[PDB]
Design a protein around this nucleic acid. Structure first.
Ligand SMILES: [Ca+2]
Ligand SMILES: [Ca+2]
Ligand SMILES: [Ca+2]
Lengths: 217, 222
DNA sequence: GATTCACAGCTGATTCACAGCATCTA
DNA sequence: CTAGATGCTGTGAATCAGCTGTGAAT
């Protein structure tokens, strides 16, 4: 059975399939629309658990549509896709992500709005607060940058899975990022000197394959 | 069980929705209307505990709508949404009792607070650590001694106290504390947090924290 | 004066590229 | 054995996030 029913609405088909492929892979049941009519129809046809909405769409905007769905009885929270004005995106049970986004941030925020509508991350001695973005190593606090935290959360969620540098970059970095994978090497080096300082090495290198967060064998 | 039954009357659909969503999320049972006839119909069927009326409306203004409700024997207290430039004298004389007003554009935090007061007055001190606030008088105490706050500094502080221990991003604060039509920079929140820290965060133990790239949180250091 | 808030200087954090060194393996 | 491939990390530049002082306007 799926994690949730998600309606993805954006006038850009490339943003729509990028989200639908990632979320379909993460266990979600995904329906799409590239306009307000299609959106209203699909939402009435499938009654989703949450809606991902491009804020800037030709003709009918999401706000008009949300008002109609909620007046029917569909109280599904919205995760707005906004450009980098439009305000009110954090009212009720809704939240938003700015374009260009990363796959990790869209799923993370989507999961928050769903949990909020209807619990710290740990691996060995690493503790993550998804709310505050606070980190601890052996009960001691460690300060991490936004990128360092997203990367650690990716590894923790995917503990014991070998993750290649191109895969990490496609999930952790924004989809408009134009550089190579040495940025991943740099951020693994920072993570190591901040949260892999204990007797046992937890973040491992497998040459030409990837990185893996696992307890030493 | 709902906090109260509220009837929201305004001619603009998205003002009604802005109000509806916020009050529903706060634990209120919200009924709506876009005119005086629907308003009287909803009031007869739902029997609201408070009514929120837009003053400037076509056909029949908010004052007209209230007069019709009261003529029907619906004595629920009212909260008027007034225009800044007009009916100044009429609003002063019509709010001497149980009814109150907020000027449009309003802050969602101020509407809700003013609704809780008219509901309370019709049949009271917020606290966090050594900070005390009177929701009715707008007085603030920091470790038993008074502190003078502006209207914006007061709405900001109450938002933090009510939501103590919860991380609040600058856009979330702007959406709730600032006037809904605010088209400015998040720096305004940075400014008012600096105003608050200078007055209420003055001891060895920090209460109002910054989590870089996340937001602000009011909590004891632990 | 009180107030709101725009704006800009400042600071330290953050992102990221780049290169030279280390280690691995063909 | 060596030599290229692959990975690590110090240096530095550019940008950014958040804090605060000044001042315009009401
Ligand atoms: Ca668009
Ligand atoms: Ca990519
Ligand atoms: Ca009106």
């Amino acid at each position: 059975t799926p994690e949730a029913r998600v309606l993805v609405v954006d006038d850009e088909a490339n943003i729509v399939e990028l989200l639908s492929v990632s979320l379909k892979f993460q266990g979600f049941e995904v329906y799409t629309a590239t306009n307000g009519a299609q959106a209203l129809d699909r939402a009435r046809e499938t009654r989703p658990d949450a809606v991902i909405l491009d804020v800037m769409m030709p003709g009918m905007d999401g706000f008009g549509v949300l008002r109609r769905l909620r007046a029917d009885g569909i109280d599904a929270p919205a995760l707005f896709l906004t450009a980098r004005k439009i305000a009110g995106l954090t009212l009720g049970g809704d939240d938003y992500v700015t374009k260009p986004f990363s796959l990790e941030e869209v799923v993370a925020r989507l999961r928050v709005i769903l949990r909020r509508a209807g619990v710290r991350l740990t691996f060995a001695d690493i503790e993550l607060d998804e709310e505050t973005h606070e980190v601890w190593k052996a009960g001691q606090p460690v300060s991490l940058s936004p990128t360092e935290f997203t990367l650690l959360r990716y590894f923790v969620i995917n503990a014991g899975t070998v993750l290649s540098k191109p895969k990490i970059l496609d999930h952790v970095w924004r989809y408009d990022f134009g550089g190579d994978v040495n940025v991943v090497e740099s951020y693994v080096s920072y993570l190591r000197r901040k949260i892999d300082t204990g007797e046992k090495r937890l973040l491992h290198t497998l040459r030409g394959v990837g990185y893996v967060l696992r307890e030493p064998r």
